Enzyme design. Sequence first.
Site, PDB file in Angstrom:
ATOM      1  N   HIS A 179      14.202 -26.046  19.066  1.00 44.83           N
ATOM      2  CA  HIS A 179      13.690 -25.514  20.549  1.00 44.83           C
ATOM      3  C   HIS A 179      14.810 -26.764  21.713  1.00 44.83           C
ATOM      4  CE1 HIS A 179      10.784 -26.635  23.156  1.00 44.83           C
ATOM      5  NE2 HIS A 179       9.989 -27.406  23.349  1.00 44.83           N
ATOM      6  N   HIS A 182      11.686 -25.338  27.151  1.00 50.51           N
ATOM      7  CA  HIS A 182      11.184 -25.749  28.313  1.00 50.51           C
ATOM      8  C   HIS A 182      11.545 -27.193  28.309  1.00 50.51           C
ATOM      9  CE1 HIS A 182       7.729 -24.242  25.717  1.00 50.51           C
ATOM     10  NE2 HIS A 182       8.572 -23.375  26.854  1.00 50.51           N
ATOM     11  N   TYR A 184      13.539 -29.296  26.965  1.00 52.69           N
ATOM     12  CA  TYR A 184      14.566 -30.559  27.270  1.00 52.69           C
ATOM     13  C   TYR A 184      16.088 -30.621  26.492  1.00 52.69           C
ATOM     14  CZ  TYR A 184       9.517 -30.643  26.669  1.00 52.69           C
ATOM     15  OH  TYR A 184       7.786 -31.401  27.070  1.00 52.69           O
TER      16      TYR A 184
HETATM   17  C1  LIG Z   1      -1.230 -28.931  23.869  1.00 55.66           C
HETATM   18  C2  LIG Z   1      -0.061 -28.161  24.335  1.00 55.66           C
HETATM   19  C3  LIG Z   1       1.478 -28.519  23.806  1.00 55.66           C
HETATM   20  C4  LIG Z   1       2.402 -28.392  22.991  1.00 55.66           C
HETATM   21  N1  LIG Z   1       3.386 -28.757  22.679  1.00 55.66           N
HETATM   22  C5  LIG Z   1       4.310 -27.606  22.446  1.00 55.66           C
HETATM   23  C6  LIG Z   1       5.849 -28.312  21.928  1.00 55.66           C
HETATM   24  O1  LIG Z   1       5.417 -28.948  21.455  1.00 55.66           O
HETATM   25  N2  LIG Z   1       6.839 -27.376  21.366  1.00 55.66           N
HETATM   26  C7  LIG Z   1       6.955 -25.815  22.601  1.00 55.66           C
HETATM   27  O2  LIG Z   1       7.801 -25.397  22.470  1.00 55.66           O
HETATM   28  N3  LIG Z   1       5.730 -25.772  23.024  1.00 55.66           N
HETATM   29  C8  LIG Z   1       4.647 -26.216  23.013  1.00 55.66           C
HETATM   30  N4  LIG Z   1       3.881 -26.379  23.859  1.00 55.66           N
HETATM   31  C9  LIG Z   1       3.548 -24.970  24.550  1.00 55.66           C
HETATM   32  C10 LIG Z   1       3.045 -23.829  23.607  1.00 55.66           C
HETATM   33  O3  LIG Z   1       3.794 -23.387  21.837  1.00 55.66           O
HETATM   34  C11 LIG Z   1       2.507 -22.615  23.839  1.00 55.66           C
HETATM   35  O4  LIG Z   1       3.955 -21.801  24.565  1.00 55.66           O
HETATM   36  C12 LIG Z   1       1.536 -22.348  25.004  1.00 55.66           C
HETATM   37  O5  LIG Z   1       0.016 -22.689  24.273  1.00 55.66           O
HETATM   38  C13 LIG Z   1       1.329 -21.462  26.222  1.00 55.66           C
HETATM   39  O6  LIG Z   1       0.278 -20.247  25.482  1.00 55.66           O
HETATM   40  P1  LIG Z   1      -1.389 -20.172  25.055  1.00 55.66           P
HETATM   41  O7  LIG Z   1      -1.248 -19.864  26.547  1.00 55.66           O
HETATM   42  O8  LIG Z   1      -1.259 -19.822  23.870  1.00 55.66           O
HETATM   43  O9  LIG Z   1      -1.580 -21.633  24.870  1.00 55.66           O
HETATM   44  C14 LIG Z   1       2.662 -27.064  24.548  1.00 55.66           C
HETATM   45  C15 LIG Z   1       1.321 -26.022  24.826  1.00 55.66           C
HETATM   46  C16 LIG Z   1      -0.006 -26.977  24.612  1.00 55.66           C
HETATM   47  C17 LIG Z   1      -1.086 -26.317  25.282  1.00 55.66           C
HETATM   48  C1  LIG Z   2       2.020 -33.445  32.837  1.00 61.74           C
HETATM   49  C2  LIG Z   2       1.708 -34.011  31.917  1.00 61.74           C
HETATM   50  O1  LIG Z   2       0.592 -34.679  31.272  1.00 61.74           O
HETATM   51  C3  LIG Z   2       3.131 -34.046  30.380  1.00 61.74           C
HETATM   52  C4  LIG Z   2       2.370 -35.540  29.006  1.00 61.74           C
HETATM   53  C5  LIG Z   2       2.678 -34.686  28.190  1.00 61.74           C
HETATM   54  C6  LIG Z   2       3.106 -33.227  28.519  1.00 61.74           C
HETATM   55  C7  LIG Z   2       3.179 -32.101  27.093  1.00 61.74           C
HETATM   56  C8  LIG Z   2       3.699 -31.808  25.922  1.00 61.74           C
HETATM   57  C9  LIG Z   2       4.336 -31.055  25.235  1.00 61.74           C
HETATM   58  C10 LIG Z   2       4.894 -30.147  25.851  1.00 61.74           C
HETATM   59  C11 LIG Z   2       6.468 -29.851  25.195  1.00 61.74           C
HETATM   60  C12 LIG Z   2       6.445 -28.372  25.528  1.00 61.74           C
HETATM   61  O2  LIG Z   2       7.720 -27.826  24.951  1.00 61.74           O
HETATM   62  C13 LIG Z   2       6.823 -27.794  26.494  1.00 61.74           C
HETATM   63  C14 LIG Z   2       5.484 -29.102  27.601  1.00 61.74           C
HETATM   64  C15 LIG Z   2       4.488 -29.927  27.185  1.00 61.74           C
HETATM   65  C16 LIG Z   2       3.357 -28.926  27.020  1.00 61.74           C
HETATM   66  C17 LIG Z   2       4.796 -30.895  27.645  1.00 61.74           C
HETATM   67  C18 LIG Z   2       3.749 -30.930  29.319  1.00 61.74           C
HETATM   68  C19 LIG Z   2       3.396 -31.946  30.206  1.00 61.74           C
HETATM   69  C20 LIG Z   2       3.050 -32.860  29.655  1.00 61.74           C
HETATM   70  C21 LIG Z   2       1.177 -32.526  29.374  1.00 61.74           C
END
Ligand SMILES: Cc1cc2nc3c(=O)[nH]c(=O)nc-3n(C[C@H](O)[C@H](O)[C@H](O)COP(=O)(O)O)c2cc1C
Ligand SMILES: CC(=O)[C@H]1CC[C@H]2[C@@H]3CCC4=CC(=O)CC[C@]4(C)[C@H]3CC[C@]12C
Length: 362
Positions: A179, A182, A184
């Site tokens: 990862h 985003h 991190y």
């Molecule tokens: C509920 C939620 C959780 C996500 N958690 C991660 C994550 O664990 N790791 C990551 O790299 N992106 C995470 N993302 C981003 C998704 O992998 C993806 O980039 C995002 O869903 C945008 O595409 P979509 O329009 O197909 O949902 C998350 C997105 C959502 C909606």
């Molecule tokens: C703003 C907020 O509530 C936070 C709490 C949990 C968070 C998400 C946790 C999971 C995550 C992982 C990613 O790699 C992209 C950002 C996201 C998708 C985060 C976006 C912002 C969130 C939705």
Amino acid sequence: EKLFTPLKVGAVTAPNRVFMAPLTRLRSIEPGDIPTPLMGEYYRQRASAGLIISEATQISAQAKGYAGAPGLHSPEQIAAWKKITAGVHAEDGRIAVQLWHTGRISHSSIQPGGQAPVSASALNANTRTSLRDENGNAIRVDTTTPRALELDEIPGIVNDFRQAVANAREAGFDLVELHSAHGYLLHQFLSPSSNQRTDQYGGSVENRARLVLEVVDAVCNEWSADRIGIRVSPIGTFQNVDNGPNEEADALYLIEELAKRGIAYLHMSETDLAGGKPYSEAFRQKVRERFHGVIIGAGAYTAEKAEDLIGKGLIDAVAFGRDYIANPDLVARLQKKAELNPQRPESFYGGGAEGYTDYPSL
Ligand SMILES: Cc1cc2nc3c(=O)[nH]c(=O)nc-3n(C[C@H](O)[C@H](O)[C@H](O)COP(=O)(O)O)c2cc1C
Ligand SMILES: CC(=O)[C@H]1CC[C@H]2[C@@H]3CCC4=CC(=O)CC[C@]4(C)[C@H]3CC[C@]12C
């Protein structure tokens, strides 16, 4: 359609190009950050995906930034993940584990010792994370200001990624996804906005990319390059982390370096959920001529956009996020041009079966 044709992805072969994006769902057991049988069921339901990429998973206890996110560092976590990969394999699926360190997107109350989280530099993410209240429900909380890693702590980070990849092999994952996106930890080092270091891990792009490339080399050496993917979000702003004033050149530098390792895939997260500017086809062509493995695109894709870009030879696969949350049989639905289930974003994070395993198949 090309979406439903096979693709070699490192050590495995995907039967289609419809991938399940990594999706944090914050349903793990605490204490212990342990995957659950419910999580096993959720992944098994989605095993027709060309590739499942798991929710982001901690490489170490220090890596934790969200209550309910699972780890892959303890014996109990490894034991639980073995059940999940077994279930996916029972349905002839493939699953990659996404491995993160959250760095400054974290809170002291879930760090070892209750101490500040770590990052490249000591500035606050100015983002929200998700903790659990006294009843186990997800709540939004401001991130804690981090401490800058000492130089002598950086090898330990690399070792934690290495060890987590060793654990992934034991647990029966098919691939690992680093990862590096985003906002991190790896992205915190990559971005000038979050990295003000003046040692060999900050300043120039070579220095800013140093940690992620050390991690890539360590994990390729631990397992094999054809088991390793990486997720990047190198153009645009993601969770308040931009990619600096030379984002395109810096992205192409990183990609050229990744190509030298011969890794399985490059997964490009193209936009933040709150929006961003589209990739140009010219940029996609520059990426394509620098990377010789699989390229996965993600970020508000439709099947139409996926087919267009795969047909143009610019990407090989698409990762769908929210459509996969809501449609366990997304592959069949897209192949048959069936309607999709409605999404319930209120149950994306935390909770239980509702909004998790209760979205129906056709
Ligand atoms: C509920 C939620 C959780 C996500 N958690 C991660 C994550 O664990 N790791 C990551 O790299 N992106 C995470 N993302 C981003 C998704 O992998 C993806 O980039 C995002 O869903 C945008 O595409 P979509 O329009 O197909 O949902 C998350 C997105 C959502 C909606
Ligand atoms: C703003 C907020 O509530 C936070 C709490 C949990 C968070 C998400 C946790 C999971 C995550 C992982 C990613 O790699 C992209 C950002 C996201 C998708 C985060 C976006 C912002 C969130 C939705």
